[PDB]
Design an enzyme around this catalytic site. Structure first.
Site, PDB file in Angstrom:
ATOM      1  N   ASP A  43       1.213  -1.477  -0.454  1.00  0.00           N
ATOM      2  CA  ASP A  43       0.152  -0.720   0.081  1.00  0.00           C
ATOM      3  C   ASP A  43       0.853   1.306   0.057  1.00  0.00           C
ATOM      4  O   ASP A  43       1.634   1.052   1.091  1.00  0.00           O
ATOM      5  CB  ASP A  43      -0.759   0.006   0.976  1.00  0.00           C
ATOM      6  N   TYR A  48       2.942  10.015   0.936  1.00  0.00           N
ATOM      7  CA  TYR A  48       3.643   9.208   1.614  1.00  0.00           C
ATOM      8  C   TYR A  48       5.338   9.743   1.406  1.00  0.00           C
ATOM      9  O   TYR A  48       6.223   9.322   1.890  1.00  0.00           O
ATOM     10  CB  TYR A  48       3.809   7.808   1.703  1.00  0.00           C
ATOM     11  N   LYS A  77      -2.187   6.195  -4.236  1.00  0.00           N
ATOM     12  CA  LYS A  77      -3.111   7.354  -4.224  1.00  0.00           C
ATOM     13  C   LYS A  77      -3.222   8.014  -4.688  1.00  0.00           C
ATOM     14  O   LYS A  77      -2.529   8.706  -4.741  1.00  0.00           O
ATOM     15  CB  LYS A  77      -3.826   6.889  -2.258  1.00  0.00           C
ATOM     16  N   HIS A 110      -7.508   9.324  -2.795  1.00  0.00           N
ATOM     17  CA  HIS A 110      -6.460   9.020  -1.442  1.00  0.00           C
ATOM     18  C   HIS A 110      -7.728   9.529   0.049  1.00  0.00           C
ATOM     19  O   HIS A 110      -8.051   8.737   0.639  1.00  0.00           O
ATOM     20  CB  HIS A 110      -5.738   9.623  -1.112  1.00  0.00           C
TER      21      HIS A 110
HETATM   22  N1  LIG Z   1      -6.536   5.592   2.879  1.00  0.00           N
HETATM   23  C1  LIG Z   1      -5.600   6.668   4.197  1.00  0.00           C
HETATM   24  O1  LIG Z   1      -5.814   7.703   4.461  1.00  0.00           O
HETATM   25  C2  LIG Z   1      -4.506   5.984   5.329  1.00  0.00           C
HETATM   26  C3  LIG Z   1      -4.599   7.017   6.362  1.00  0.00           C
HETATM   27  C4  LIG Z   1      -3.170   6.297   7.440  1.00  0.00           C
HETATM   28  C5  LIG Z   1      -2.604   4.748   7.058  1.00  0.00           C
HETATM   29  N2  LIG Z   1      -3.079   4.386   5.725  1.00  0.00           N
HETATM   30  C6  LIG Z   1      -2.354   2.911   5.225  1.00  0.00           C
HETATM   31  O2  LIG Z   1      -2.415   1.724   6.275  1.00  0.00           O
HETATM   32  C7  LIG Z   1      -1.238   1.093   6.523  1.00  0.00           C
HETATM   33  C8  LIG Z   1      -1.364   0.814   8.082  1.00  0.00           C
HETATM   34  O3  LIG Z   1      -1.748   1.711   8.674  1.00  0.00           O
HETATM   35  P1  LIG Z   1      -0.426   2.690   9.645  1.00  0.00           P
HETATM   36  O4  LIG Z   1       0.812   2.798   9.283  1.00  0.00           O
HETATM   37  O5  LIG Z   1      -1.211   4.376   9.928  1.00  0.00           O
HETATM   38  O6  LIG Z   1      -0.233   2.859  11.118  1.00  0.00           O
HETATM   39  P2  LIG Z   1      -0.380   0.602  11.731  1.00  0.00           P
HETATM   40  O7  LIG Z   1      -0.517  -0.321  10.892  1.00  0.00           O
HETATM   41  O8  LIG Z   1      -1.885   0.269  12.372  1.00  0.00           O
HETATM   42  O9  LIG Z   1      -0.068   0.384  12.808  1.00  0.00           O
HETATM   43  C9  LIG Z   1       1.857   0.618  12.571  1.00  0.00           C
HETATM   44  C10 LIG Z   1       2.916   0.916  13.844  1.00  0.00           C
HETATM   45  O10 LIG Z   1       3.307   0.117  13.949  1.00  0.00           O
HETATM   46  C11 LIG Z   1       4.156  -1.009  15.081  1.00  0.00           C
HETATM   47  N3  LIG Z   1       3.871  -2.246  14.110  1.00  0.00           N
HETATM   48  C12 LIG Z   1       4.162  -2.819  13.758  1.00  0.00           C
HETATM   49  N4  LIG Z   1       3.700  -4.678  13.582  1.00  0.00           N
HETATM   50  C13 LIG Z   1       3.987  -4.223  14.828  1.00  0.00           C
HETATM   51  C14 LIG Z   1       4.039  -5.429  15.872  1.00  0.00           C
HETATM   52  N5  LIG Z   1       4.133  -6.733  15.341  1.00  0.00           N
HETATM   53  N6  LIG Z   1       4.073  -5.712  17.557  1.00  0.00           N
HETATM   54  C15 LIG Z   1       4.858  -4.038  17.197  1.00  0.00           C
HETATM   55  N7  LIG Z   1       4.475  -2.586  16.782  1.00  0.00           N
HETATM   56  C16 LIG Z   1       3.953  -2.975  15.592  1.00  0.00           C
HETATM   57  C17 LIG Z   1       4.936  -0.075  13.995  1.00  0.00           C
HETATM   58  O11 LIG Z   1       6.077   0.301  14.325  1.00  0.00           O
HETATM   59  P3  LIG Z   1       7.556   0.103  13.279  1.00  0.00           P
HETATM   60  O12 LIG Z   1       7.586   0.556  11.651  1.00  0.00           O
HETATM   61  O13 LIG Z   1       8.835   1.252  13.836  1.00  0.00           O
HETATM   62  O14 LIG Z   1       7.756  -1.362  13.352  1.00  0.00           O
HETATM   63  C18 LIG Z   1       4.319   0.890  13.207  1.00  0.00           C
HETATM   64  O15 LIG Z   1       5.144   2.271  14.571  1.00  0.00           O
HETATM   65  C19 LIG Z   1       0.085   2.508   6.748  1.00  0.00           C
HETATM   66  O16 LIG Z   1       1.281   2.592   6.534  1.00  0.00           O
HETATM   67  C20 LIG Z   1      -1.646   2.989   4.928  1.00  0.00           C
HETATM   68  O17 LIG Z   1      -0.183   2.531   3.793  1.00  0.00           O
HETATM   69  C21 LIG Z   1      -3.901   4.958   5.223  1.00  0.00           C
HETATM   70  O1  LIG Z   2      -3.373  10.327   4.243  1.00  0.00           O
HETATM   71  C1  LIG Z   2      -2.983   9.431   4.737  1.00  0.00           C
HETATM   72  O2  LIG Z   2      -2.851   8.022   4.675  1.00  0.00           O
HETATM   73  C2  LIG Z   2      -2.484   9.152   6.275  1.00  0.00           C
HETATM   74  N1  LIG Z   2      -2.085  10.795   7.159  1.00  0.00           N
HETATM   75  C3  LIG Z   2      -1.228  11.776   6.585  1.00  0.00           C
HETATM   76  C4  LIG Z   2      -0.949  12.985   6.741  1.00  0.00           C
HETATM   77  C5  LIG Z   2      -2.287  12.747   8.129  1.00  0.00           C
HETATM   78  O3  LIG Z   2      -2.922  14.310   8.848  1.00  0.00           O
HETATM   79  N2  LIG Z   2      -3.302  12.357   8.532  1.00  0.00           N
HETATM   80  C6  LIG Z   2      -4.269  12.710   8.523  1.00  0.00           C
HETATM   81  C7  LIG Z   2      -5.635  13.216   7.443  1.00  0.00           C
HETATM   82  N3  LIG Z   2      -7.168  13.605   7.667  1.00  0.00           N
HETATM   83  C8  LIG Z   2      -7.658  14.010   6.858  1.00  0.00           C
HETATM   84  C9  LIG Z   2      -8.760  14.225   6.310  1.00  0.00           C
HETATM   85  C10 LIG Z   2      -8.812  14.680   5.742  1.00  0.00           C
HETATM   86 CL1  LIG Z   2     -10.769  15.181   5.169  1.00  0.00          CL
HETATM   87  C11 LIG Z   2      -8.263  15.150   4.446  1.00  0.00           C
HETATM   88  C12 LIG Z   2      -6.950  14.986   4.067  1.00  0.00           C
HETATM   89  C13 LIG Z   2      -6.811  14.786   5.969  1.00  0.00           C
HETATM   90  S1  LIG Z   2      -4.937  13.958   6.267  1.00  0.00           S
HETATM   91  C14 LIG Z   2      -3.435  11.219   7.241  1.00  0.00           C
HETATM   92  O4  LIG Z   2      -4.703  10.229   7.786  1.00  0.00           O
END
Ligand SMILES: NC(=O)c1ccc[n+]([C@@H]2O[C@H](COP(=O)([O-])OP(=O)(O)OC[C@H]3O[C@@H](n4cnc5c(N)ncnc54)[C@H](OP(=O)(O)O)[C@@H]3O)[C@@H](O)[C@H]2O)c1
Ligand SMILES: O=C(O)Cn1ccc(=O)n(Cc2nc3cc(Cl)ccc3s2)c1=O
EC number: 1.1.1.21
Length: 315
Positions: A43, A48, A77, A110
Protein backbone atom coordinates in the site's frame (compact mmCIF):
# COMPACT_ATOMS: atom_id res chain seq x y z
CA UNK A 1 -8.48 -17.73 0.85
CA UNK A 2 -5.41 -15.47 0.69
CA UNK A 3 -6.89 -13.21 -1.98
CA UNK A 4 -10.27 -11.64 -2.56
CA UNK A 5 -12.07 -11.17 -5.84
CA UNK A 6 -12.50 -7.59 -7.07
CA UNK A 7 -15.24 -6.36 -9.42
CA UNK A 8 -12.70 -6.02 -12.22
CA UNK A 9 -12.09 -9.79 -12.06
CA UNK A 10 -8.69 -9.46 -10.36
CA UNK A 11 -7.68 -11.04 -7.01
CA UNK A 12 -6.30 -8.83 -4.21
CA UNK A 13 -4.18 -10.30 -1.40
CA UNK A 14 -5.97 -9.78 1.93
CA UNK A 15 -2.69 -8.98 3.65
CA UNK A 16 -0.55 -6.11 2.45
CA UNK A 17 2.33 -3.93 3.68
CA UNK A 18 1.59 -0.36 4.80
CA UNK A 19 4.18 2.32 3.98
CA UNK A 20 2.95 5.55 5.60
CA UNK A 21 5.71 6.96 7.82
CA UNK A 22 8.18 4.39 6.42
CA UNK A 23 11.27 6.56 6.09
CA UNK A 24 12.87 6.51 2.64
CA UNK A 25 16.10 5.63 4.37
CA UNK A 26 14.52 2.37 5.58
CA UNK A 27 11.52 1.41 3.44
CA UNK A 28 13.50 -0.17 0.58
CA UNK A 29 14.80 -2.76 2.99
CA UNK A 30 11.32 -3.08 4.52
CA UNK A 31 9.79 -3.91 1.18
CA UNK A 32 12.58 -6.31 0.24
CA UNK A 33 12.12 -8.24 3.50
CA UNK A 34 8.37 -8.23 3.09
CA UNK A 35 8.56 -9.68 -0.40
CA UNK A 36 11.08 -12.31 0.79
CA UNK A 37 8.77 -13.59 3.53
CA UNK A 38 5.75 -13.61 1.21
CA UNK A 39 3.94 -10.29 1.06
CA UNK A 40 2.53 -9.60 -2.38
CA UNK A 41 0.46 -6.43 -1.78
CA UNK A 42 2.05 -3.06 -0.96
CA UNK A 43 0.00 0.00 0.00
CA UNK A 44 1.56 3.21 -1.24
CA UNK A 45 0.82 6.87 -1.74
CA UNK A 46 2.49 9.83 -3.37
CA UNK A 47 1.86 11.84 -0.21
CA UNK A 48 4.02 9.34 1.70
CA UNK A 49 7.11 10.73 -0.18
CA UNK A 50 8.79 7.29 -0.35
CA UNK A 51 7.41 5.78 -3.57
CA UNK A 52 10.81 5.92 -5.25
CA UNK A 53 12.30 3.79 -2.48
CA UNK A 54 9.44 1.31 -2.64
CA UNK A 55 10.03 1.22 -6.41
CA UNK A 56 13.70 0.36 -5.83
CA UNK A 57 12.76 -2.57 -3.61
CA UNK A 58 10.25 -3.90 -6.09
CA UNK A 59 12.51 -3.67 -9.14
CA UNK A 60 15.34 -5.37 -7.34
CA UNK A 61 13.30 -8.36 -6.28
CA UNK A 62 11.93 -8.65 -9.81
CA UNK A 63 15.42 -8.73 -11.18
CA UNK A 64 16.40 -11.28 -8.50
CA UNK A 65 13.64 -13.53 -9.91
CA UNK A 66 12.00 -13.67 -6.47
CA UNK A 67 8.65 -12.58 -7.79
CA UNK A 68 7.10 -11.59 -11.07
CA UNK A 69 5.01 -8.45 -11.50
CA UNK A 70 1.79 -10.35 -12.19
CA UNK A 71 2.10 -11.77 -8.68
CA UNK A 72 2.37 -8.30 -7.15
CA UNK A 73 -0.58 -6.15 -6.05
CA UNK A 74 0.56 -2.52 -5.92
CA UNK A 75 -1.85 0.16 -4.66
CA UNK A 76 -1.32 3.89 -4.69
CA UNK A 77 -3.46 6.96 -4.04
CA UNK A 78 -4.27 10.30 -5.71
CA UNK A 79 -3.52 13.06 -3.20
CA UNK A 80 -6.03 15.89 -2.40
CA UNK A 81 -4.14 18.65 -4.22
CA UNK A 82 -4.57 16.84 -7.58
CA UNK A 83 -8.35 16.40 -7.73
CA UNK A 84 -8.73 18.67 -10.74
CA UNK A 85 -9.54 16.67 -13.87
CA UNK A 86 -6.47 17.98 -15.71
CA UNK A 87 -4.10 17.01 -12.86
CA UNK A 88 -5.13 13.40 -12.31
CA UNK A 89 -3.21 11.57 -15.08
CA UNK A 90 0.00 13.44 -14.35
CA UNK A 91 -0.34 12.54 -10.67
CA UNK A 92 -0.80 8.88 -11.60
CA UNK A 93 2.10 8.89 -14.02
CA UNK A 94 4.38 10.45 -11.37
CA UNK A 95 3.51 7.57 -9.04
CA UNK A 96 4.08 4.98 -11.78
CA UNK A 97 7.41 6.57 -12.58
CA UNK A 98 8.55 6.70 -8.93
CA UNK A 99 7.49 3.09 -8.41
CA UNK A 100 9.08 2.16 -11.77
CA UNK A 101 5.88 0.38 -12.85
CA UNK A 102 3.86 0.43 -16.09
CA UNK A 103 0.57 -0.05 -14.24
CA UNK A 104 -1.05 0.01 -10.85
CA UNK A 105 -3.25 -2.84 -9.65
CA UNK A 106 -5.40 -0.41 -7.68
CA UNK A 107 -5.58 3.39 -7.58
CA UNK A 108 -7.57 5.26 -5.04
CA UNK A 109 -8.93 8.70 -4.39
CA UNK A 110 -7.01 9.19 -1.16
CA UNK A 111 -9.54 11.48 0.53
CA UNK A 112 -12.87 12.84 -0.82
CA UNK A 113 -11.69 16.41 -0.19
CA UNK A 114 -9.88 18.44 -2.82
CA UNK A 115 -7.16 20.87 -1.67
CA UNK A 116 -5.86 23.96 -3.48
CA UNK A 117 -3.47 22.80 -6.18
CA UNK A 118 0.23 23.47 -5.71
CA UNK A 119 3.44 22.15 -4.25
CA UNK A 120 2.26 21.93 -0.67
CA UNK A 121 0.38 18.76 0.28
CA UNK A 122 -1.53 20.51 3.09
CA UNK A 123 -1.91 24.11 1.94
CA UNK A 124 -2.95 26.42 4.76
CA UNK A 125 -4.33 29.93 4.95
CA UNK A 126 -2.89 32.40 7.48
CA UNK A 127 -5.23 31.13 10.22
CA UNK A 128 -4.31 27.46 9.85
CA UNK A 129 -7.34 26.39 7.82
CA UNK A 130 -6.63 24.06 4.94
CA UNK A 131 -7.50 25.72 1.65
CA UNK A 132 -9.91 23.62 -0.44
CA UNK A 133 -10.12 23.33 -4.21
CA UNK A 134 -13.32 23.81 -6.16
CA UNK A 135 -13.40 20.19 -7.24
CA UNK A 136 -16.15 17.64 -6.68
CA UNK A 137 -16.14 13.86 -6.23
CA UNK A 138 -17.88 12.91 -9.44
CA UNK A 139 -15.56 14.84 -11.75
CA UNK A 140 -12.57 13.39 -9.92
CA UNK A 141 -14.07 9.95 -10.37
CA UNK A 142 -14.47 10.48 -14.11
CA UNK A 143 -10.79 11.33 -14.27
CA UNK A 144 -10.01 8.08 -12.39
CA UNK A 145 -12.10 6.14 -14.94
CA UNK A 146 -9.94 7.49 -17.73
CA UNK A 147 -6.84 5.95 -16.16
CA UNK A 148 -8.46 2.55 -16.41
CA UNK A 149 -9.49 3.17 -20.00
CA UNK A 150 -5.89 4.15 -20.74
CA UNK A 151 -4.32 1.07 -19.12
CA UNK A 152 -2.44 2.98 -16.45
CA UNK A 153 -4.46 1.22 -13.68
CA UNK A 154 -6.32 -2.11 -13.55
CA UNK A 155 -8.81 -0.98 -10.91
CA UNK A 156 -9.90 2.20 -9.15
CA UNK A 157 -11.46 2.92 -5.81
CA UNK A 158 -11.87 5.42 -2.99
CA UNK A 159 -10.60 5.90 0.54
CA UNK A 160 -12.10 7.63 3.58
CA UNK A 161 -15.48 8.01 1.83
CA UNK A 162 -18.60 7.90 3.96
CA UNK A 163 -21.55 5.90 2.69
CA UNK A 164 -23.24 8.98 1.22
CA UNK A 165 -20.12 9.84 -0.77
CA UNK A 166 -19.91 6.21 -1.97
CA UNK A 167 -23.56 6.36 -3.03
CA UNK A 168 -22.87 9.54 -5.03
CA UNK A 169 -20.47 7.63 -7.22
CA UNK A 170 -22.67 4.54 -7.43
CA UNK A 171 -25.59 6.67 -8.65
CA UNK A 172 -23.47 8.78 -10.97
CA UNK A 173 -25.18 9.17 -14.32
CA UNK A 174 -23.12 7.45 -16.97
CA UNK A 175 -20.83 5.70 -14.48
CA UNK A 176 -18.21 3.62 -16.32
CA UNK A 177 -16.43 1.76 -13.48
CA UNK A 178 -17.86 1.08 -10.00
CA UNK A 179 -15.34 1.58 -7.15
CA UNK A 180 -13.57 -1.71 -6.40
CA UNK A 181 -12.44 -0.84 -2.90
CA UNK A 182 -13.08 1.60 -0.09
CA UNK A 183 -9.99 1.86 2.16
CA UNK A 184 -11.01 3.01 5.66
CA UNK A 185 -9.64 3.17 9.18
CA UNK A 186 -10.69 0.01 10.97
CA UNK A 187 -9.69 -1.66 14.25
CA UNK A 188 -11.33 -2.73 17.60
CA UNK A 189 -11.90 0.92 18.77
CA UNK A 190 -13.40 1.90 15.37
CA UNK A 191 -15.13 -1.19 14.04
CA UNK A 192 -17.08 0.48 11.22
CA UNK A 193 -19.99 -2.00 11.29
CA UNK A 194 -22.42 0.17 9.27
CA UNK A 195 -19.96 1.33 6.64
CA UNK A 196 -18.63 -2.15 6.18
CA UNK A 197 -22.21 -3.46 5.96
CA UNK A 198 -22.97 -0.83 3.35
CA UNK A 199 -19.85 -1.37 1.31
CA UNK A 200 -20.08 -5.13 1.29
CA UNK A 201 -23.74 -5.10 0.32
CA UNK A 202 -22.66 -3.11 -2.75
CA UNK A 203 -19.93 -5.48 -3.83
CA UNK A 204 -17.27 -3.09 -2.69
CA UNK A 205 -14.22 -4.54 -0.91
CA UNK A 206 -13.17 -2.84 2.28
CA UNK A 207 -9.54 -2.41 3.20
CA UNK A 208 -8.67 -1.80 6.88
CA UNK A 209 -5.97 0.79 7.60
CA UNK A 210 -4.18 1.53 10.85
CA UNK A 211 -5.20 -1.94 12.12
CA UNK A 212 -2.79 -1.58 15.03
CA UNK A 213 -3.89 1.94 16.01
CA UNK A 214 -1.08 3.80 14.20
CA UNK A 215 0.96 4.34 17.39
CA UNK A 216 3.55 6.23 15.29
CA UNK A 217 1.00 8.78 14.01
CA UNK A 218 2.63 12.21 14.41
CA UNK A 219 -0.23 13.72 16.51
CA UNK A 220 -0.51 10.93 19.09
CA UNK A 221 -1.18 11.97 22.71
CA UNK A 222 0.16 9.98 25.70
CA UNK A 223 -3.36 9.59 27.07
CA UNK A 224 -4.70 8.19 23.83
CA UNK A 225 -5.92 4.58 23.90
CA UNK A 226 -3.35 2.12 22.56
CA UNK A 227 -4.56 -1.10 20.92
CA UNK A 228 -1.18 -2.74 21.07
CA UNK A 229 -0.95 -2.17 24.81
CA UNK A 230 -4.59 -3.09 25.60
CA UNK A 231 -4.50 -5.81 28.28
CA UNK A 232 -7.81 -7.31 27.09
CA UNK A 233 -6.37 -7.98 23.61
CA UNK A 234 -3.09 -9.18 25.06
CA UNK A 235 -5.07 -11.89 26.90
CA UNK A 236 -6.82 -12.99 23.73
CA UNK A 237 -3.44 -13.23 22.03
CA UNK A 238 -1.80 -15.25 24.83
CA UNK A 239 -4.66 -17.76 24.61
CA UNK A 240 -3.75 -18.26 20.93
CA UNK A 241 -0.02 -18.07 21.59
CA UNK A 242 0.17 -15.16 19.18
CA UNK A 243 1.16 -11.52 19.60
CA UNK A 244 -1.26 -8.65 20.09
CA UNK A 245 -0.52 -7.39 16.59
CA UNK A 246 -1.14 -10.79 15.05
CA UNK A 247 -4.55 -10.84 16.56
CA UNK A 248 -5.21 -7.27 15.48
CA UNK A 249 -4.32 -8.32 11.92
CA UNK A 250 -6.29 -11.60 12.01
CA UNK A 251 -9.35 -9.70 13.18
CA UNK A 252 -10.18 -7.82 9.92
CA UNK A 253 -9.24 -10.90 7.90
CA UNK A 254 -12.07 -12.79 9.60
CA UNK A 255 -14.50 -9.99 8.62
CA UNK A 256 -13.77 -10.48 4.93
CA UNK A 257 -11.65 -7.33 4.85
CA UNK A 258 -8.24 -6.60 3.39
CA UNK A 259 -5.70 -5.40 5.98
CA UNK A 260 -2.47 -3.42 5.58
CA UNK A 261 -0.31 -3.23 8.73
CA UNK A 262 2.79 -1.07 8.46
CA UNK A 263 6.28 -1.85 9.67
CA UNK A 264 9.91 -1.08 8.77
CA UNK A 265 11.25 -3.49 11.43
CA UNK A 266 12.24 -6.79 9.71
CA UNK A 267 11.20 -8.96 12.67
CA UNK A 268 7.76 -7.34 12.90
CA UNK A 269 7.36 -7.52 9.11
CA UNK A 270 7.71 -11.30 9.38
CA UNK A 271 5.68 -11.52 12.59
CA UNK A 272 2.75 -9.66 11.05
CA UNK A 273 2.66 -12.11 8.14
CA UNK A 274 2.26 -15.20 10.32
CA UNK A 275 -1.49 -14.87 10.66
CA UNK A 276 -2.64 -17.65 8.37
CA UNK A 277 -1.93 -20.42 10.89
CA UNK A 278 -4.68 -19.68 13.42
CA UNK A 279 -8.29 -18.62 13.81
CA UNK A 280 -9.92 -16.22 16.25
CA UNK A 281 -12.98 -17.85 17.83
CA UNK A 282 -16.55 -16.65 17.57
CA UNK A 283 -16.25 -15.26 21.11
CA UNK A 284 -12.91 -13.59 20.34
CA UNK A 285 -14.50 -11.83 17.38
CA UNK A 286 -17.51 -10.79 19.39
CA UNK A 287 -15.19 -9.54 22.14
CA UNK A 288 -13.00 -7.52 19.83
CA UNK A 289 -16.03 -5.88 18.20
CA UNK A 290 -17.42 -4.89 21.60
CA UNK A 291 -14.36 -2.71 22.19
CA UNK A 292 -15.65 -0.19 19.62
CA UNK A 293 -15.59 3.40 20.86
CA UNK A 294 -15.95 5.01 17.44
CA UNK A 295 -12.48 6.39 18.05
CA UNK A 296 -10.48 7.35 15.00
CA UNK A 297 -6.83 8.31 14.75
CA UNK A 298 -6.81 9.71 11.20
CA UNK A 299 -8.73 12.98 10.87
CA UNK A 300 -7.74 16.57 10.03
CA UNK A 301 -9.50 19.10 12.27
CA UNK A 302 -8.08 21.97 10.25
CA UNK A 303 -10.21 20.64 7.34
CA UNK A 304 -13.50 19.94 9.12
CA UNK A 305 -15.31 22.74 7.29
CA UNK A 306 -14.69 21.23 3.81
CA UNK A 307 -18.01 20.56 2.05
CA UNK A 308 -16.78 17.00 1.48
CA UNK A 309 -15.27 16.33 4.89
CA UNK A 310 -16.30 12.71 5.47
CA UNK A 311 -16.64 12.20 9.22
CA UNK A 312 -19.58 14.45 10.05
CA UNK A 313 -22.00 11.77 8.88
CA UNK A 314 -22.80 8.80 11.05
CA UNK A 315 -21.06 6.45 8.58
N1 LIG B 1 -5.97 5.71 3.10
C1 LIG B 1 -5.54 6.48 4.08
O1 LIG B 1 -5.96 7.61 4.31
C2 LIG B 1 -4.61 5.82 5.11
C3 LIG B 1 -4.39 6.46 6.38
C4 LIG B 1 -3.53 5.85 7.33
C5 LIG B 1 -2.89 4.61 7.05
N2 LIG B 1 -3.17 4.06 5.77
C6 LIG B 1 -2.30 2.89 5.29
O2 LIG B 1 -2.39 1.86 6.29
C7 LIG B 1 -1.06 1.46 6.74
C8 LIG B 1 -1.13 0.95 8.18
O3 LIG B 1 -1.63 2.04 9.02
P1 LIG B 1 -0.60 2.90 9.89
O4 LIG B 1 0.73 2.99 9.21
O5 LIG B 1 -1.33 4.18 10.14
O6 LIG B 1 -0.41 2.11 11.26
P2 LIG B 1 -0.44 0.59 11.81
O7 LIG B 1 -0.19 -0.38 10.75
O8 LIG B 1 -1.69 0.53 12.60
O9 LIG B 1 0.76 0.69 12.87
C9 LIG B 1 2.07 1.00 12.45
C10 LIG B 1 2.89 1.22 13.77
O10 LIG B 1 2.91 -0.06 14.48
C11 LIG B 1 4.18 -0.58 14.63
N3 LIG B 1 4.24 -2.01 14.54
C12 LIG B 1 4.12 -2.78 13.40
N4 LIG B 1 4.10 -4.08 13.62
C13 LIG B 1 4.22 -4.15 15.01
C14 LIG B 1 4.26 -5.34 15.76
N5 LIG B 1 4.18 -6.57 15.26
N6 LIG B 1 4.39 -5.16 17.13
C15 LIG B 1 4.47 -3.88 17.67
N7 LIG B 1 4.44 -2.74 16.91
C16 LIG B 1 4.31 -2.90 15.54
C17 LIG B 1 5.02 0.11 13.58
O11 LIG B 1 6.38 0.20 14.02
P3 LIG B 1 7.68 0.07 13.01
O12 LIG B 1 7.21 0.35 11.63
O13 LIG B 1 8.67 1.05 13.61
O14 LIG B 1 8.07 -1.42 13.25
C18 LIG B 1 4.39 1.52 13.43
O15 LIG B 1 4.89 2.41 14.43
C19 LIG B 1 -0.24 2.76 6.45
O16 LIG B 1 1.15 2.62 6.44
C20 LIG B 1 -0.84 3.19 5.10
O17 LIG B 1 -0.25 2.35 4.10
C21 LIG B 1 -4.00 4.61 4.80
O1 LIG C 1 -3.19 10.30 4.35
C1 LIG C 1 -2.71 9.31 4.89
O2 LIG C 1 -2.73 8.12 4.32
C2 LIG C 1 -2.07 9.40 6.25
N1 LIG C 1 -2.28 10.72 6.83
C3 LIG C 1 -1.31 11.59 6.70
C4 LIG C 1 -1.37 12.80 7.29
C5 LIG C 1 -2.52 13.11 8.12
O3 LIG C 1 -2.62 14.20 8.66
N2 LIG C 1 -3.49 12.16 8.19
C6 LIG C 1 -4.81 12.51 8.69
C7 LIG C 1 -5.68 13.10 7.62
N3 LIG C 1 -6.94 13.28 7.73
C8 LIG C 1 -7.54 13.85 6.67
C9 LIG C 1 -8.85 14.29 6.56
C10 LIG C 1 -9.22 14.76 5.30
CL1 LIG C 1 -10.90 15.17 5.06
C11 LIG C 1 -8.32 15.06 4.26
C12 LIG C 1 -6.97 14.73 4.46
C13 LIG C 1 -6.63 14.14 5.66
S1 LIG C 1 -4.98 13.66 6.06
C14 LIG C 1 -3.35 10.96 7.55
O4 LIG C 1 -4.24 10.13 7.65
Amino acid sequence: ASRILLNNGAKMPILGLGTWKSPPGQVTEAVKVAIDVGYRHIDCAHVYQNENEVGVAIQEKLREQVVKREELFIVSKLWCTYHEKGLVKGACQKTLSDLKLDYLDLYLIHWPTGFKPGKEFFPLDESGNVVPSDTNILDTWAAMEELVDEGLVKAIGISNFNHLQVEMILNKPGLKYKPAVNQIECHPYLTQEKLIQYCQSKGIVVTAYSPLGSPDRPWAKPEDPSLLEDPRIKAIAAKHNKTTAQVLIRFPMQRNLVVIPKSVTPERIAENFKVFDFELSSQDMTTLLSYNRNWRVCALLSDTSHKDYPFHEEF
